[PDB]
Scaffold this active site. Structure first.
Site, PDB file in Angstrom:
ATOM      1  N   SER A   5     -42.995  68.820  37.917  1.00 30.69           N
ATOM      2  CA  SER A   5     -42.702  69.619  39.122  1.00 30.69           C
ATOM      3  C   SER A   5     -43.906  69.733  40.080  1.00 30.69           C
ATOM      4  O   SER A   5     -44.241  68.755  40.762  1.00 30.69           O
ATOM      5  CB  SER A   5     -42.196  71.016  38.717  1.00 30.69           C
ATOM      6  OG  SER A   5     -41.577  71.660  39.820  1.00 30.69           O
ATOM      7  N   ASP A  54     -39.829  65.004  37.473  1.00 29.95           N
ATOM      8  CA  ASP A  54     -39.086  65.822  38.411  1.00 29.95           C
ATOM      9  C   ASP A  54     -40.045  66.445  39.433  1.00 29.95           C
ATOM     10  O   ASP A  54     -40.106  67.673  39.566  1.00 29.95           O
ATOM     11  CB  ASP A  54     -38.308  66.902  37.640  1.00 29.95           C
ATOM     12  CG  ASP A  54     -36.838  67.010  38.075  1.00 29.95           C
ATOM     13  OD1 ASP A  54     -36.305  66.082  38.745  1.00 29.95           O
ATOM     14  OD2 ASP A  54     -36.197  68.003  37.668  1.00 29.95           O
ATOM     15  N   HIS A  67     -33.936  71.034  35.857  1.00 30.37           N
ATOM     16  CA  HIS A  67     -35.377  71.066  36.085  1.00 30.37           C
ATOM     17  C   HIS A  67     -36.191  71.444  34.847  1.00 30.37           C
ATOM     18  O   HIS A  67     -37.218  70.824  34.562  1.00 30.37           O
ATOM     19  CB  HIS A  67     -35.688  72.051  37.220  1.00 30.37           C
ATOM     20  CG  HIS A  67     -37.036  71.863  37.858  1.00 30.37           C
ATOM     21  ND1 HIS A  67     -37.580  70.619  38.115  1.00 30.37           N
ATOM     22  CD2 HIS A  67     -37.923  72.769  38.329  1.00 30.37           C
ATOM     23  CE1 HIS A  67     -38.752  70.774  38.708  1.00 30.37           C
ATOM     24  NE2 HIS A  67     -38.991  72.066  38.836  1.00 30.37           N
TER      25      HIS A  67
HETATM   26  C1  LIG Z   1     -42.480  73.939  41.725  1.00 29.56           C
HETATM   27  N1  LIG Z   1     -41.906  74.398  40.445  1.00 29.56           N
HETATM   28  C2  LIG Z   1     -40.693  75.005  40.231  1.00 29.56           C
HETATM   29  N2  LIG Z   1     -39.701  75.296  41.222  1.00 29.56           N
HETATM   30  C3  LIG Z   1     -39.573  74.547  42.486  1.00 29.56           C
HETATM   31  C4  LIG Z   1     -38.135  74.415  42.960  1.00 29.56           C
HETATM   32  S1  LIG Z   1     -37.555  75.922  43.300  1.00 29.56           S
HETATM   33  O1  LIG Z   1     -36.150  75.924  43.028  1.00 29.56           O
HETATM   34  O2  LIG Z   1     -37.776  76.222  44.690  1.00 29.56           O
HETATM   35  C5  LIG Z   1     -38.343  77.009  42.304  1.00 29.56           C
HETATM   36  C6  LIG Z   1     -38.761  76.392  40.960  1.00 29.56           C
HETATM   37  C7  LIG Z   1     -40.402  75.364  38.904  1.00 29.56           C
HETATM   38  C8  LIG Z   1     -41.312  75.104  37.876  1.00 29.56           C
HETATM   39  O3  LIG Z   1     -41.090  75.432  36.560  1.00 29.56           O
HETATM   40  C9  LIG Z   1     -42.170  75.356  35.605  1.00 29.56           C
HETATM   41  C10 LIG Z   1     -41.940  76.421  34.552  1.00 29.56           C
HETATM   42  C11 LIG Z   1     -41.944  77.769  34.903  1.00 29.56           C
HETATM   43  C12 LIG Z   1     -41.729  78.747  33.928  1.00 29.56           C
HETATM   44  F1  LIG Z   1     -41.724  80.072  34.217  1.00 29.56           F
HETATM   45  C13 LIG Z   1     -41.503  78.384  32.610  1.00 29.56           C
HETATM   46  O4  LIG Z   1     -41.257  79.378  31.682  1.00 29.56           O
HETATM   47  C14 LIG Z   1     -40.025  80.017  31.778  1.00 29.56           C
HETATM   48  C15 LIG Z   1     -39.072  79.531  32.678  1.00 29.56           C
HETATM   49  C16 LIG Z   1     -37.835  80.140  32.818  1.00 29.56           C
HETATM   50  C17 LIG Z   1     -37.529  81.247  32.030  1.00 29.56           C
HETATM   51 CL1  LIG Z   1     -35.922  82.035  32.189  1.00 29.56          CL
HETATM   52  C18 LIG Z   1     -38.455  81.740  31.122  1.00 29.56           C
HETATM   53  C19 LIG Z   1     -38.104  82.943  30.277  1.00 29.56           C
HETATM   54  F2  LIG Z   1     -39.184  83.690  30.128  1.00 29.56           F
HETATM   55  F3  LIG Z   1     -37.148  83.650  30.860  1.00 29.56           F
HETATM   56  F4  LIG Z   1     -37.665  82.575  29.087  1.00 29.56           F
HETATM   57  C20 LIG Z   1     -39.705  81.129  31.001  1.00 29.56           C
HETATM   58  C21 LIG Z   1     -41.483  77.041  32.260  1.00 29.56           C
HETATM   59  F5  LIG Z   1     -41.246  76.687  30.983  1.00 29.56           F
HETATM   60  C22 LIG Z   1     -41.706  76.060  33.225  1.00 29.56           C
HETATM   61  N3  LIG Z   1     -42.482  74.517  38.170  1.00 29.56           N
HETATM   62  C23 LIG Z   1     -42.754  74.176  39.441  1.00 29.56           C
HETATM   63  O5  LIG Z   1     -43.842  73.621  39.716  1.00 29.56           O
END
Ligand SMILES: Cn1c(N2CCS(=O)(=O)CC2)cc(OCc2cc(F)c(Oc3ccc(Cl)c(C(F)(F)F)c3)c(F)c2)nc1=O
Length: 369
Positions: free
Chosen positions: A220, A243, A298
């Site tokens: 990302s 991605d 993603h």
């Molecule tokens: C630029 N970008 C992202 N986006 C750009 C497109 S957008 O739709 O405008 C916004 C998203 C998402 C991302 O994700 C990396 C990432 C982030 C996290 F917070 C992670 O940890 C997460 C991710 C989601 C969740 Cl629900 C949870 C939880 F705590 F709830 F379990 C933890 C992960 F594994 C990876 N990394 C990025 O670099």
């Protein structure tokens, strides 16, 4: 833990290295072929502040941090913590750049599989305020005490996004390059005192790197980091963008990347304005490949895709239609084929050469977009 063991024949160790101790120094997590396979005990998310960090990123209350911490605070990932490095061979090296809201430990599935196939992997923690959280030390004595100084994600106004995201991807490339230098210099005998006190002796890294076989990989934001790092640093001989999020890049990078570049996309994240930047990288005199993992989202590239059950996973968009193990295998195997072909590896990874072409029931050659 449901984070997959690596499919390769090497046993896998993990440790953390920070040097120097300051906010400008290098922080990374290492996955590496280990001598012995005694115990898969590596703490997945090893500090409370990251759960707080995540909550702040996700938009959640002050309580969700504690909830996530309660759910995952002791979950492991299958690597032997501080296990000795397997001697007797130089390994190709990968530098890994985490996406926005992530941090160094959230891509262990990718890292561990690479390590189990003969790679040392350095997953860097960025200090561009794109990580949910990260830490450093204010002086040597704080490092000695474990008196950490935490840095949290920076929320941006729309006015800021163009300038600041481009400043961050530049810093990020510089940190991939800095990290590469630290490893290469340890490889050639630079004495380092790890700012973390861990059992793993960094002396072992002496003459363990195959210095001609280096790749940068990234998810990302880390995908964009790959493209920026390639343009700055010809020590990276190829790049693999998982991605990618292309928005941070200035228009000047496209003309400047000689090395092979591989785009691996999820089916459900990509959109035309992002894809068109990827196609800008294409030139007859360059190798660019693109595949799309069918029915993936993603988050299929990050470890949280293995942190919940099927239904919750879909609800949270941590999981796609495709099984998360089938996705990440297709992504690791395609990658291994790509790394062999362009790093010049003498292994059997070219058995997945078809996957670079998207020749699988679960792959789209190119893009749907
Ligand atoms: C630029 N970008 C992202 N986006 C750009 C497109 S957008 O739709 O405008 C916004 C998203 C998402 C991302 O994700 C990396 C990432 C982030 C996290 F917070 C992670 O940890 C997460 C991710 C989601 C969740 Cl629900 C949870 C939880 F705590 F709830 F379990 C933890 C992960 F594994 C990876 N990394 C990025 O670099």
């Amino acid at each position: 833990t449901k984070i997959p063991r690596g499919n390769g024949p090497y046993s896998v160790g993990c440790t953390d290295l920070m040097f120097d101790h300051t906010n400008k120094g290098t922080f990374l997590r290492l996955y590496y072929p280990s001598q012995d396979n005694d115990r898969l005990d590596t703490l997945w998310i090893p500090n409370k502040e990251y759960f707080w960090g995540l909550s702040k990123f996700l938009g959640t209350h002050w309580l969700m941090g504690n909830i996530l911490r309660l759910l995952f605070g002791s979950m492991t990932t299958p690597a032997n913590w501080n296990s000795p490095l397997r001697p007797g061979e130089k390994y190709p090296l990968v530098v890994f750049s985490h996406g926005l809201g992530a941090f160094r430990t959230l891509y262990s599935a990718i890292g561990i599989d690479l390590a189990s196939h003969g790679f040392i992997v350095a997953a860097v923690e960025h200090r561009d305020r794109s990580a949910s959280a990260t830490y450093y030390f204010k002086d040597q004595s704080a490092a000695e005490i474990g008196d950490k100084s935490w840095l949290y994600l920076r929320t941006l106004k729309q006015e800021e996004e163009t300038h600041i995201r481009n400043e961050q991807v530049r810093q990020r490339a510089k940190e991939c390059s800095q990290a590469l230098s630290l490893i290469l210099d340890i490889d050639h005998g630079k004495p380092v005192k790890n700012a973390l006190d861990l059992k793993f002796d960094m002396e072992q890294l002496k003459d363990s790197i195959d210095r001609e076989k280096i790749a940068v990989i990234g998810h990302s934001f880390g995908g964009a980091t790959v493209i920026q790092t390639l343009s700055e640093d010809q020590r990276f001989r190829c790049g693999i963008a998982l991605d990618a999020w292309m928005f941070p890049l200035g228009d000047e990078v496209y003309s400047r990347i000689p090395q092979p570049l591989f785009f691996i996309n999820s089916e459900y994240f990509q959109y035309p304005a992002n894809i068109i930047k990827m196609k800008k990288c294409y030139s007859p005199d360059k190798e660019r490949k693109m595949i799309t993992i069918r029915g993936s989202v993603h988050q299929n590239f990050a470890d949280f895709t293995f942190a919940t059950g099927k239904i919750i996973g879909h609800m949270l968009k941590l999981k796609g239609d495709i099984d998360s193990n089938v996705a990440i295998d297709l992504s690791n195997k395609a990658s291994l084929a790509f790394l062999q072909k362009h790093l010049g590896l003498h292994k059997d990874f070219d058995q997945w050469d078809c996957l670079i072409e998207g020749d699988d029931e679960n792959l789209i050659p190119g893009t749907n977009i």
